[PDB]
Amino acid sequence: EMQLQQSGAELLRPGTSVKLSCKTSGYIFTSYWIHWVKQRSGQGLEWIARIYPGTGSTYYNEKFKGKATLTADKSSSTAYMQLSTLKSEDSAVYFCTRWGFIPVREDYVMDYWGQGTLVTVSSAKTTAPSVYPLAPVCGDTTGSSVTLGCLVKGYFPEPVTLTWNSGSLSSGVHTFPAVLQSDLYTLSSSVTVTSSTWPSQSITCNVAHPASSTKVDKKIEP
Amino acid sequence: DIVMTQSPLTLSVTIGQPASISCKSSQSLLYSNGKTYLNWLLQRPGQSPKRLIHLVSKLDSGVPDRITGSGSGTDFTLKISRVEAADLGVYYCVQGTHFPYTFGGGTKLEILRADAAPTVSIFPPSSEQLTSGGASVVCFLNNFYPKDINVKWKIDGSERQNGVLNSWTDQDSKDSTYSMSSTLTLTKDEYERHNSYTCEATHKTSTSPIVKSFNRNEC
Numbered sequence: 001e002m003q004l005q006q007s008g009a010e011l012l013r014p015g016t017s018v019k020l021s022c023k024t025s026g027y028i029f030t031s032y033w034i035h036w037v038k039q040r041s042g043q044g045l046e047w048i049a050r051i052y053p054g055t056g057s058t059y060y061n062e063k064f065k066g067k068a069t070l071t072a073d074k075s076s077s078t079a080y081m082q083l084s085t086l087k088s089e090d091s092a093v094y095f096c097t098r099w100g101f102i103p104v105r106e107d108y109v110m111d112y113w114g115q116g117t118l119v120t121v122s123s124a125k126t127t128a129p130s131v132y133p134l135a136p137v138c139g140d141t142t143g144s145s146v147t148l149g150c151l152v153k154g155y156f157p158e159p160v161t162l163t164w165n166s167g168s169l170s171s172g173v174h175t176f177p178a179v180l181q182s183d184l185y186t187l188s189s190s191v192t193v194t195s196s197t198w199p200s201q202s203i204t205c206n207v208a209h210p211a212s213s214t215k216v217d218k219k220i221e222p
Numbered sequence: 223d224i225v226m227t228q229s230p231l232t233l234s235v236t237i238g239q240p241a242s243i244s245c246k247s248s249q250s251l252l253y254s255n256g257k258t259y260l261n262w263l264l265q266r267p268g269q270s271p272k273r274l275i276h277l278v279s280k281l282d283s284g285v286p287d288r289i290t291g292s293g294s295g296t297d298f299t300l301k302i303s304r305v306e307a308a309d310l311g312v313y314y315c316v317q318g319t320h321f322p323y324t325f326g327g328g329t330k331l332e333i334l335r336a337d338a339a340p341t342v343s344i345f346p347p348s349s350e351q352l353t354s355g356g357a358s359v360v361c362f363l364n365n366f367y368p369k370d371i372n373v374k375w376k377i378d379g380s381e382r383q384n385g386v387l388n389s390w391t392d393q394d395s396k397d398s399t400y401s402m403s404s405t406l407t408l409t410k411d412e413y414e415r416h417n418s419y420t421c422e423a424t425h426k427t428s429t430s431p432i433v434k435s436f437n438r439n440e441c
């Protein structure tokens with residue numbers, strides 16, 4: 001089972017640099033080209049560069065010479081991409097991929113991708129979120145089924161992790177993408193259950209904000 | 223660099239119908255060895271991109287043959303014979319014939335389903351938040367279709383445009399509907415000065431506005 005695991009989200013100060021890692025397993029690392037791709041604001045892909053771990057040979061897209069430097073450690077089967085002197089345009093999601101084109105066969109083998117590493121270039125301060133439970137009053141939807149909510153506000157930077165009943169309750173859940181306003185993000189999630197379940201058995205919102213080591217549980221009381 | 227132009231930007235198709243996406247290049251993609259390096263990738267919501275097709279028409283391993291690709295020179299087409307729910311996502315054509323490799327801007331495929339009315343829930347500020355001096359009123363408008371919807375907040379009859387924060391989910395791969403959250407934030411002081419809080423929505427499924435509200439008082 002071929003896998004590529006990338007490092008976590010990075011908050012970088014303007015003018016500084018970061019080193020992203022792409023750890024592989026399941027195939028011979030030295031025999032295939034690893035490519036890095038950039039993704040800005042949803043749909044908008046750009047090819048950065050490629051490296052062949054076996055020899056250290058690299059090819060760069062002109063736009064990124066001096067911006068990106070690719071390396072590969074054969075002993076740990078890890079590919080790295082260093083980004084230097086970060087600015088506005090560098091905030092994006094970066095993917096590494098064992099693309100699969102075999103130059104000698106003029107054909108392809110399956111492509112495998114990492115999960116992506118989000119880089120945020122900002123000088124705004126890290127802020128822990130406030131988690132607020134949302135119990136119905138008119139958001140009861142009458143009998144049959146009732147929807148509860150959880151409001152996570154005033155945090156920076158992304159991401160935040162929100163689960164219900166520690167992952168147990170996953171159906172009838174809608175988690176909305178965070179929206180930035182005044183240097184702080186706001187996120188919310190709703191869960192729809194039947195009148196028989198709540199309030200009878202408890203529903204709890206779990207929130208984690210790694211950047212600030214915040215982990216908080218909020219039970220939705222009537 | 224080679225410019226790749228995809229059309230349409232978005233396409234709405236019902237399950238069982240065919241779909242086709244077009245990709246045009248500013249230079250011929252015929253490489254000097256006679257091969258045409260044009261690939262098609264699919265990026266499903268929240269997932270990494272995946273190659274569907276290589277060399278214009280060759281399907282990658284594990285890709286359903288309901289998907290086909292054709293074209294030559296500067297014009298290429300991806301066709302899906304019968305759309306299924308799992309085809310939801312953004313499709314991209316990417317050329318590798320000319321250095322550097324370049325991508326098309328993407329085509330979002332959305333599954334057209336029957337009109338669905340939003341289920342609306344409204345929530346007053348929690349005690350916790352009020353204690354801190356803030357007050358957010360939240361309105362969830364769940365499982366509706368089409369995505370086109372307009373929400374307005376009204377406090378005691380007059381529209382409130384400031385302090386509103388909206389967010390939409392992408393199309394759900396289970397029922398093909400959309401959901402949206404709308405949060406109005408005020409100070410605790412101002413919250414306690416008004417009575418009625420209304421979340422009002424305009425949607426194709428109703429000739430009159432869809433309303434949800436509450437009156438804050440005491441007891």
Ligand SMILES: C[C@H](NC(=O)CCCP(=O)(O)Oc1ccc([N+](=O)[O-])cc1)C(=O)O
Nearest residue numbers: 035037099101259316317318319320321323
């Ligand atoms: C530019 C030039 N051409 C070739 O050798 C053929 C490369 C074809 P490809 O499908 O691997 O290109 C791509 C590789 C990677 C991506 N990607 O999206 O990662 C896209 C296309 C060269 O290297 O001399």
Ligand SMILES: [Zn+2]
Nearest residue numbers: 107108276280
């Ligand atoms: Zn092939």
Ligand SMILES: [Zn+2]
Nearest residue numbers: 249319320321
């Ligand atoms: Zn060329």
Ligand SMILES: [Zn+2]
Nearest residue numbers: 254319320321
């Ligand atoms: Zn040439």
Ligand SMILES: [Zn+2]
Nearest residue numbers: 377378380416
């Ligand atoms: Zn008034």
Ligand SMILES: [Zn+2]
Nearest residue numbers: 378415416417
């Ligand atoms: Zn008045």
Ligand SMILES: [Zn+2]
Nearest residue numbers: 378415416417
């Ligand atoms: Zn008033």
Ligand SMILES: [Zn+2]
Nearest residue numbers: 378415416417
């Ligand atoms: Zn009044």
